[PDB]
């Protein structure tokens, strides 16, 4: 079901634990939409309603496979393009390379120096092209 | 699948104060009633007095005469309190008072006013970011009450101030305290609950935990109908009898006879002790079986023993089998005196009969084993199962031999540090933590027995269940002994819970220490010894982080980082290595003082008037080493700090998550329309959610950002100047994380 990264599983684990209000290692459907929203995957009415029908409680392995199914729907192409966009104050599609070091390495799951150097390869470098590469 | 989940659900209740000893103390056969000084009512009376005193500060035009860092503390505290206040009239009283301080700082100390406004655009409770260093030690709130409030404090108020004079933090209302405490462990925090006053040094880690716990609600755990301690079972079936051959008897361990099998595992016949009832053996059978059945459900890592029977055997037969082996006489004395003895028969790997401190394990296998033991202890704790006799740890004041209390300061009146451990290495000699994982599973308690007046709590913790007496507590007017302590009757279960968490990790520490002493005693190589003790420190820190992970869900890497903010691993390794080996017993006074300076690095050296035993060290009995002198504290200061750090992160976080969801529920009600309100106080409720998120946790912040957007759609007609920078910072991070996950996949 799940080809997820170490980091995704760390995140979904803490999130599951937090919204497991009684510590029995299962969440109710009450919480499911709110927890889903917390992980960037706010569901439609129907998708949330479909998940609710499938059922009371949901353990953590069942969660790691609901999440993968919703993740398949996501266009990588768009979800990555809308992220880079934040760093584009203007509509130029241009960001700075001296900078993008000081972003990737100072925020989130921070990149290592080797990873930052490896990225700068692929004065300035534009984002709209970079997504087309992958 | 096999469903993963616990047979226990945790909730809340009105009080733990049901069926408890009367709150009374008997002195010269006179009955003295013990009264509780309410924590919340008294805290609040003092914040009112603080606000009056600010009022009086303003009216004296003496702002000029208090230092700047204090005026900041006052201003920032009053902004944070105003933000926590839902009454508009009081909210407004509080900002009237802030405003003259703000007028002043702007005009006369403006590098400082600029530092303030930075914190104000990050937070609704900016005081907690201000007090992340040495500033927390300056009690600006008590200092000012002392200057401007010209009445004696009440008895209650005075008692409160006596207990929490260390920091103004202790006066903060619940959501501001909880949020300070959690963020105090963060990567940009340098706070340490330690301060040098005069030449003396004041350690106040325990007080962070008491201030926190006195704010909490009484917990309650409900075990399913299916729980081990609930489901009604029938008698045990024992349709098979193991035929004992002296030919297959490997050796005698304690009262258990060990026999080999064709499969290279072991059949154990555990024989009944003098005065041991049949039921003790029965419960070990029943608990081995339950854990074997639910093993997959619980992700139990231990290699569990497999139960085979519980039945009566002739002593003539037990004697006829054992006769040859070494230990025959000790076993003969150990076992009951009766013609018919009950046995419990089970099968187990060889690794089960290996004690977790065994010097034949190398560090890799020991680490693997410790991790298994630690995992199962906390996973089983979540399931509702407690093991109260993993080891035989005792204290002694002079002679009273008492069960060791890992958080002794929380559970009694006016005890300041962990007491000396008697014959420490012996206490774990026969620890029920094995190379395979857990053992001696029948010696176990339902977690509910910690939240009520069980035979156990009434026995080991009756000061905590009765109330606090001490002569300084006695009022002559009301005829009663008043204390903060007597208030713990309502929350006593929450205290025993945390105690249990520290106690598990204390046993792990003693087991690690025994292994280290045994492995390094004959080492010739002084850097190689030091290596072992550095690694045992890493295992101890890591275990504490595993416990955080399992109880809270904080990733272990973040938990290890939070711990190291508070507990120093260089010092822990140095202290353990010094006091858990006999080498200090050979040092002269000057060398001993020089060595002590290194292991405590500027903190006060351990003081003792005891005479050291050559080749042993501190030892009351002339033969076994102790941790501490006669009537003195344990010298493992850092261990104490680490056990308190661990237990404060777990409770700290549960209680932070509670504050969050109470705010969330308020934001969802506003957003949906179930509470009509103005724009600006919708934004305010959302910004507040930001503050209550766990430190280092992104996914909460993300949810709040989502709430924020939702709100701007609802009230588009309203500026966002006060809130834009913080939300943009959350947004940049959310965007950067997606870019990072994208790049990680590309490398593959
Ligand atoms: N049951 C206990 N478990 C752990 N430490 C204790 C216990 N009782 C007292 N202590 C501590 O041991 C030291 C000496 O004992 P006492 O003279 O009873 O205070 C003090 O520093 C106490 O805080
Ligand atoms: Ca649940
Ligand atoms: Ca045992
Ligand atoms: Ca036992």
Residue numbers in the entry:
A (entry chain C): 1 to 55, 61 to 127, 134 to 145
B (entry chain A): 98 to 495, 501 to 850
What does the paper say about this structure?
The structure was determined by the selenomethionine single wavelength anomalous dispersion (SAD) method and was refined to a resolution of 2.6 Å with good crystallographic R-factors and stereochemistry. In the SidJ–CaM complex, CaM ‘grips’ the IQ-helix with its C-lobe while its N-lobe interacts with the NRD, CTD, and kinase-like domains. In agreement with our biochemical results showing that CaM binds SidJ in a Ca2+-independent manner, only the first EF-hand of CaM is observed to coordinate with a Ca2+ ion on the difference Fourier electron density map. The SidJ core, thus named kinase-like domain, assumes a classical bilobed protein kinase fold. Surprisingly, a pyrophosphate (PPi) molecule and two Ca2+ ions are bound within the kinase catalytic cleft. In the migrated nucleotide-binding pocket, the aromatic adenine base of AMP is stacked with the imidazole ring of H492, while Y506 forms the interior wall of the pocket. The C-lobe of CaM assumes a semi-open conformation, which creates a groove between CaM helices F and G and helices E and H to grip the amphipathic IQ-helix of SidJ. However, unlike other apo-CaM complexes, where the CaM N-lobe wraps around the IQ-helix, the N-lobe in the SidJ–CaM complex rotates along the inter-lobe linker about 120 degrees and swings away from the IQ-helix to engage in extensive interactions with other parts of SidJ, particularly the βN1 strand of the NRD domain.
Through structural, biochemical, and mass spectrometric studies, we identified the biochemical function of SidJ as a protein polyglutamylase that specifically adds glutamates to a catalytic glutamate residue E860 of another Legionella effector SdeA, and thus inhibits the PR-ubiquitination process mediated by SdeA. Here, we report the crystal structure of SidJ in complex with human calmodulin 2 (CaM) and reveal that SidJ adopts a protein kinase-like fold. The SidJ-CaM structure suggests that the SidJ protein is comprised of four functional units: a N-terminal regulatory domain (NRD), a base domain (BD), a kinase-like catalytic domain, and a C-terminal domain (CTD) containing the CaM-binding IQ motif. Moreover, we found that this glutamylation activity by SidJ is CaM dependent and that the glutamylation of SdeA suppresses its PR-ubiquitination activity.
